[PDB]
Write a structure and sequence with these properties.
The structure is cut from a larger assembly and holds chains A (168 residues), B (171 residues), C (156 residues), D (210 residues) and E (218 residues). Chain B has five helices and no strands. Chain B is mainly α. In chain B, helix 2 packs across helix 5. Helices cover 57% and strands 0% of the residues of chain C. Chain C has four helices and no strands. Chain C is globular and about 50 Å long. The longest helix of chain D is centred in the first third of the chain and has 29 residues. Chain E is globular. Chain E starts with a helix and ends in a 32-residue tail after the last helix. The chains are: A mainly alpha (168), B mainly alpha (171), C mainly alpha (156), D mainly alpha (210), E mainly alpha (218). The structure holds chlorophyll A (6 copies), ligand A1EB1 (2 copies), ligand A86 and Chlorophyll c2 (2 copies). One ligand A1EB1 binds next to helix 1 and helix 4 of chain A.
């Protein structure tokens, strides 16, 4: 059932790209699971690329991130996108992870990944399923490019010389 | 017109002056006017609140030596925009309303575009809520948030024209 | 519970990509379940041991907290031999259980004689999930102890 | 263009070294490829024929009014463009910019029966101007309403003569403009103009692009 | 298809030579495929090497002659030994050359208009047409990679196969010539009749960007 999906990209001549044959023997309720994992990776990667660009360009908020122990948003931004990740206090990291996990638990109990392949029922911008398949393919391609891009940003910030066309 | 959208809250159908009981055929134009006003008001309120703690990086013109972080908060921020930037903002709004999001058909006054709903711009690539209870709730939420944003944007404008900020004194 | 085996948790269901359990004999399933459960139990013991021995090590005195150093700085050869003898005794009993013609895989209690409810399956799933978590935690703990030289309750 | 260039010229005719008639031109088509080229054939002719005749009057006499007057005449008129004020340069380009925008309006072009040139319309056809927001006395082509009573044979002869005089003048002005800077380019002239500034730079004497 | 390989070669140099391969790269299987796929891959590799070699030989002749792009960044470097011109290029220029070539061959691998791949039965060394499928490219570009101005377009198939044979022979000769020039840049005395030309050069020609490893210990 891997030949159906949406992910058939014209960059690989509109056929399924599985050189290691990872989806040869995987069955339903796992194919939908790996599609849900890919879609969540897509969305988190796109949000991560936008946030990384916002931090690297410098933007940041105005105020004090944790008035008990200093640390302004300018202090977080000035350390860089990667090195300015430990400048956040541990309580802020735990609160962010707790809110994300509450959303994860609610959406997993409401829309299980094994049954719903990455579909959490967010409205929908079009009917006419051909256009919707085109929009799904656009989402998949954008998310895959963002998956490559955020790891590229992390590698270029940590190891200089890699990613030659890296801004900042 | 008492059963249409917007007549949901504690007041029910609230028309003191009776604009739509004097002219019940003029409700659709008034609804479109209210919907555009509400959407512009939501954008304006969000801009007022977000510009206080969030500011873009870099310059604004790189020719008048004006920064994004140098525009104070409000009316003076729109003052310090260069004339080319103002012209581009007006061009964007004019192209956005005359051709893309077209609220009016008709030669001079503008009735409603065909048999569409009032404020039924954009089209095609826009979320179309099925499940008519959900659609009614979403539309009533849009209208009520628009009205609240109109009052809030008016208040912050009143504050900005007599202070340097939209925050009332004592806050 | 699919194929008579507990598992199949909520966040991800019957987790068999790569087809390890497609078209396989029940003996292979018993071997896989034995491996998974024994890994989980060893790893729960390992995680609890490093966590407790980081801050509470009274058995020999001052005995460091970097876990690979713990096994070599002391624990004389008789102690390691006694630990290995105990584990070998339990593994011999595991083999003797595996030869019996009532062999539920990870079962030394032999619960086929007693009546079981879905609460029993829930508790088995609790053991399995905690085991898998400790598998990942124990590998991570040993990796940190090699990279930095500090225990789990250290490094923080 | 079709193979009817034999009417414009025998011996030669559809010479076409760089093929250019089927490169599909933004994916529009082969007819649209022909229609765009034929318009740019004669639009470049109409500018060059007016500019070369424009040259031969500028270098001797100037209009006696005021603003584009009293600047030196014994110089290159390409340099005389650089002596214009900045408002004059903007207004000249934008006035042509109206004429370009107005002539490409397909709803104006269908008032007189024609269409946009590479959608099937005639390559060169300026509109008869009578649809503007406010009326004007004089239009652009045939202002005095003089020679629109001519038969199609005089129009067909004139259209071919417009092309052939077009190709002759595009060589005429550009070879002449190549004589102002890099002197000695045309050994037939070689006795006019100076100045090494770029003629393809209307605002070089006023500001810089970066 | 170890039979059409001989039909191609009977027209290569008459029967004076034919199917000449001492180590017999034909009748091979390679990466878990059939002999026909390997034959098509080897033919495409030979054709691509030949095209790259003719382009490189012409570029070496032009660059060592002295013809150089005036513009702006290529005016900065002032040498002659083509290899050293590549070495003193900016890193971004070399990377953009490499990535543009990579995009061109990424398009060459894509078969959305022509039905067969060059391993699955297509013509070896066939770059697919850009405008054949105008709805399956990211944005429109005219001026296709092969035949930008449609100069060949309508031609006899006999002329096409004769041109393919001519391209193959010229490619092989250009391969030999450009390797002779590179070995002139590296090994003096090698490749006679060319000793009086080319400059001495170091820096492992078959490596871009950084240098200083080389085949110093042969
Ligand atoms: C989180 C990563 C992730 C996951 C889970 C998937 C999952 C999937 N992809 Mg996919 N993809 C990804 C990332 C991912 N993709 C990226 C980044 C790209 C861009 C290169 C693509 C491009 C792509 C194409 C073009 C196609 C798919 C398709 C598919 C589906 C079937 C293939 C399959 O089962 O094998 C993937 C299953 C996995 C479990 C892969 C996990 C990742 C491995 C184990 C690790 C690899 C490490 C990597 C090599 C290190 C370098 C990467 C990076 C650092 C640069 C499946 C739902 C096909 C499809 O849907 O067609 C219907 C298809 O045609 N993908
Ligand atoms: C309390 C927090 C919380 C909880 C309960 C969940 C719960 C869930 N997340 Mg989730 N997530 C969270 C926070 C949380 N998330 C945050 C903060 C992020 C970052 C924005 C993500 C990003 C994320 C992605 C991208 C994906 C999930 C997925 C999942 C689901 C399966 C998780 C799984 O199998 O274990 C995790 C199992 C593993 C084997 C771990 C992955 C190991 C990879 C190979 C290496 C990654 C590094 C590692 C995670 C970091 C550890 C430290 C490092 C130094 C080693 C589940 C619904 C997945 C899903 O729904 O797919 C069906 C999925 O694709 N989440
Ligand atoms: C992978 C996603 C991701 C992660 C992990 C972070 C992490 C971080 N961001 Mg960040 N950010 C992101 C995306 C992300 N961002 C995006 C997409 C934007 C553009 C709007 C920003 C804009 C942004 C600014 C302007 C600032 C940060 C800052 C920070 C740091 C402090 C925490 C904070 O205040 O967050 C704030 C994060 C947000 C406001 C964005 C949250 C993501 C939105 C709400 C989408 C969530 C989807 C929703 C839950 C479900 C929809 C369905 C922290 C390192 C601050 C800092 O000190 O760094 C310079 C800061 O000033 N971020
Ligand atoms: C009614 C709509 C509206 C209007 C007229 C403005 C007007 C302005 N905003 Mg603003 N803004 C708006 C909505 C609006 N905003 C919204 C909805 C947000 C996001 C929640 C922002 C976020 C924002 C930031 C972060 C910044 C501005 C800034 C500015 C000022 C100059 C830059 C500019 O126009 O582009 C700004 C961008 C937009 C208008 C795009 C939104 C559509 C100007 C006074 C800048 C400034 O210096 O203000 C003092 C600045 O740094 N805006
Ligand atoms: C080696 C340990 C091990 C073994 C033998 C098993 C065995 C089994 N698991 Mg299981 N599992 C494990 C670890 C293990 N698990 C871990 C760590 C997790 C947490 C992510 C899970 C989560 C899990 C779920 C959620 C489910 C199972 C299920 C099953 C059963 C059927 C699936 C199957 O055929 O797997 C056969 C497994 C193997 C042959 C082991 C493959 C080992 C490979 C070679 C490891 C490769 C490296 C790995 C990908 C990453 C490790 C390195 C990392 C630390 C960097 C089977 C008895 C299913 C079940 O109970 O069905 C009723 C089920 O639903 N497992
Ligand atoms: C329970 C799972 C778990 C958790 C919570 C962490 C937690 C952490 N790991 Mg980690 N890790 C894990 C499993 C885990 N790891 C596994 C299974 C491996 C083997 C692939 C690693 C390999 C690993 C490396 C190689 C590194 C971490 C590091 C880190 C720290 C950042 C953080 C404390 C980093 C660290 O040492 O931080 C101090 C680091 O460099 N991890
Ligand atoms: C040929 C040109 C190539 C350019 C390069 C490029 O491509 O960069 C790629 C790249 C990075 C990179 C590079 C490499 C790839 C590694 C290559 C280079 O290395 C070399 C030497 O080569 C360097 C570098 C840096 O360039 C990164 C790409 C990042 C990418 C692609 C980021 C997408 C975000 C999408 C978002 C956030 C969507 C939000 C959408 C949202 C939030 C919504 O829809 C909201 C929604 O409410 C809506 C509106 C309607 C609702 O109903 C539904 C919901 C609720 C969902
Ligand atoms: C791509 C562009 C999309 C643009 C549209 C958009 O972005 O809409 C996003 C959207 C929903 C949506 C979507 C659709 C629109 C349905 C479709 C989209 O998908 C597409 C593309 O189809 C995505 C989706 C699902 O998200 C909704 C946005 C709603 C918004 C922005 C609502 C602002 C309220 C402000 C209020 C009530 C202020 C009250 C102010 C009050 C009450 C005050 O008195 C102010 C006050 O100051 C005073 C005067 C004194 C102070 O002392 C105290 C305070 C401070 C209290
Ligand atoms: C020192 C010296 O030399 O003195 C010289 C200086 C100088 C200046 C050289 C001289 C001169 C005059 C010259 C040379 C004047 C030349 C002016 C010239 C030749 C100006 C071209 C404009 C080209 C345009 C606008 C192209 C648009 C092109 C476009 C928009 C496209 O490419 C679109 C495209 O759709 C196509 C068409 C094909 C499609 O399939 C695909 C795509 C989408 C890509 C002199 C007078 O001789 C003296
Ligand atoms: C500075 C600009 C300029 C110059 C120097 C110039 C020189 C010549 C010469 C001398 C070599 C000839 C012989 C000639 C002949 C024709 N011209 Mg020109 N012409 C210029 C501009 C325009 C414009 C704007 C239009 C136009 C037209 C026609 C028509 C057809 C009319 C008809 O068929 O109704 C004919 C026959 C109109 C058009 O082609 O519309 C169909 C039209 O709108 N012309 N034209
Ligand atoms: C560095 C670049 C380069 C060089 C130096 C070069 C030299 C020669 C020479 C002189 C030695 C000849 C005589 C010749 C002849 C042919 N070339 Mg080459 N060619 C180069 C590039 C390409 C590309 C990219 C393609 C291509 C092709 C053809 C076809 C087939 C046309 C057809 O079958 O319609 C024929 C006849 C196309 C192809 O092979 O299609 C199957 C195609 O895609 N060529 N080519």
């Amino acid at each position: 059932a891997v030949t159906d999906l949406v992910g058939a990209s014209t960059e690989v001549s509109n056929k399924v790209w599985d050189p290691l044959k990872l989806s040869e023997n995987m069955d339903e309720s796992n194919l939908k699971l790996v599609r849900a994992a890919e879609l969540k990776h897509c969305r988190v990667a796109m949000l991560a690329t936008v946030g990384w660009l916002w931090t690297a360009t410098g933007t940041h908020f105005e105020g004090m991130l944790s008035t008990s122990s200093g640390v302004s948003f300018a202090d977080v931004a000035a350390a860089g996108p990667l090195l300015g990740a430990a400048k956040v206090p541990a309580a802020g990291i735990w609160q962010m992870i707790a809110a994300i996990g509450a959303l994860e638990v609610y959406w997993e109990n409401k829309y299980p990944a094994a049954e719903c392949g990455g579909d959490f029922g967010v409205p929908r911008v079009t009917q006419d399923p051909a256009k919707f398949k085109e929009i799904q393919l656009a989402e998949l391609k954008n998310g895959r490019l963002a998956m490559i891009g955020i790891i590229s940003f992390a590698c270029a910030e940590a190891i200089p010389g890699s990613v030659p066309f890296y801004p900042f | 017109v008492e059963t249409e959208l917007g007549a949901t809250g504690p007041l029910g159908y609230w028309d003191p002056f009776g604009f739509s009981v004097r002219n019940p055929e003029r409700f659709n134009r008034y609804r479109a006017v209210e919907l555009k006003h509400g959407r512009i008001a939501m954008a304006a309120t969000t801009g007022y609140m977000v510009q206080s703690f969030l500011r873009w990086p870099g310059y604004l013109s790189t020719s008048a030596n004006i920064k994004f972080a140098d525009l104070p908060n409000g009316i003076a921020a729109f003052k310090a925009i260069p004339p080319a930037g103002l012209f581009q903002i007006l061009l964007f709004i004019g192209a956005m309303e005359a051709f893309t999001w077209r609220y009016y058909e008709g030669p001079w006054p503008g009735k409603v575009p065909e048999g569409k709903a009032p404020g039924d711009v954009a089209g095609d690539l826009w979320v179309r809520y099925t499940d008519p209870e959900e659609k009614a709730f979403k539309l009533n939420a849009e209208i009520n948030n628009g009205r609240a944003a109109m009052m809030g944007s008016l208040g912050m404008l009143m504050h900005d024209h007599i202070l340097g900020t939209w925050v009332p004194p004592g806050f | 519970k699919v194929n008579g085996m507990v598992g199949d948790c909520k966040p991800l269901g019957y987790f068999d990509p790569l087809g390890f359990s497609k078209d396989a004999s029940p003996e292979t399933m018993a071997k896989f379940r034995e491996a998974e459960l024994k890994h989980g139990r060893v790893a729960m013991l390992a995680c609890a041991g490093m966590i407790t021995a980081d801050k509470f090590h009274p058995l020999f005195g001052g005995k460091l907290s970097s876990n690979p150093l713990l096994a070599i700085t002391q624990v004389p050869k008789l102690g390691l031999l006694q630990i290995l003898l105990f584990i070998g005794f339990m593994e011999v009993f595991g083999i003797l259980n595996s030869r019996r013609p009532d062999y539920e895989p990870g079962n030394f209690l032999g619960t086929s004689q007693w009546e079981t409810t879905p609460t029993w399956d829930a508790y088995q799933l609790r053991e399995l999930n905690n085991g898998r978590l400790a598998m990942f935690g124990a590998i991570g703990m040993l990796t940190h102890a090699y990279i930095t030289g500090k225990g789990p309750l250290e490094l923080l | 263009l079709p193979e009817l260039s034999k009417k414009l010229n025998p011996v030669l005719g559809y010479w076409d070294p760089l093929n250019l008639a089927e490169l599909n031109f933004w994916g529009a088509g082969d007819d649209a490829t022909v229609g765009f080229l034929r318009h740019a054939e004669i639009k470049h002719g109409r500018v060059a024929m007016a500019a070369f005749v424009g040259y031969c009057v500028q270098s001797n006499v100037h209009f006696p009014w005021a603003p584009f007057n009293s600047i030196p005449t014994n110089i290159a008129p390409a340099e005389q463009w650089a002596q214009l004020p900045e408002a004059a340069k903007w207004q000249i380009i934008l006035f042509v910019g109206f004429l370009e925008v107005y002539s490409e309006h397909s709803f104006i072009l269908e008032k007189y029966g024609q269409k946009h040139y590479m959608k099937g319309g005639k390559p060169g056809f300026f509109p008869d101007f009578d649809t503007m927001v406010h009326p004007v006395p004089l239009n652009l082509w045939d202002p005095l309403k003089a020679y629109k009573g001519a038969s199609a044979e005089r129009k067909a002869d004139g259209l071919l003569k417009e092309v052939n005089n077009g190709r002759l003048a595009m060589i005429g002005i550009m070879g002449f403009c190549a004589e102002a800077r890099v002197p000695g380019a045309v050994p037939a002239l070689s006795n006019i103009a100076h100045y090494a500034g770029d003629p393809m730079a209307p605002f070089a004497a006023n500001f810089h692009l970066p | 298809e170890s039979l059409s390989d001989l039909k191609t070669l009977a027209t290569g140099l008459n029967p004076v030579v034919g199917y000449w391969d001492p180590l017999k790269l034909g009748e091979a299987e390679f990466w878990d495929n059939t002999n026909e796929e390997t034959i098509g891959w080897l033919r495409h590799a030979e054709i691509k090497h030949g095209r790259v070699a003719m382009a490189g030989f012409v570029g070496f002749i032009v660059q060592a002659n002295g013809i150089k792009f005036p513009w702006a960044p290529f005016n900065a470097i002032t040498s002659t030994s083509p290899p050293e011109q590549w070495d003193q290029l900016p890193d971004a220029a070399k990377w953009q050359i490499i990535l543009g070539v990579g995009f061109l061959e990424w398009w060459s691998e894509i078969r959305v208009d022509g039905t067969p791949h060059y391993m699955k039965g297509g013509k070896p060394g066939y770059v697919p047409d850009f405008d054949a499928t105008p709805d399956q490219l990211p944005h429109w570009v005219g001026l296709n990679l092969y035949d930008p101005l449609k100069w060949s377009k309508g031609a006899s198939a006999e002329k096409k196969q004769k041109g393919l044979l001519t391209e193959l022979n010229n490619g092989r000769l250009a391969m030999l010539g450009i390797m002779g020039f590179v070995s002139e840049a590296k090994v003096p005395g090698s490749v006679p009749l060319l000793k009086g030309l080319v400059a001495p050069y170091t820096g492992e020609v078959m490596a871009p960007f950084a240098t200083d490893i080389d085949w110093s210990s042969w």
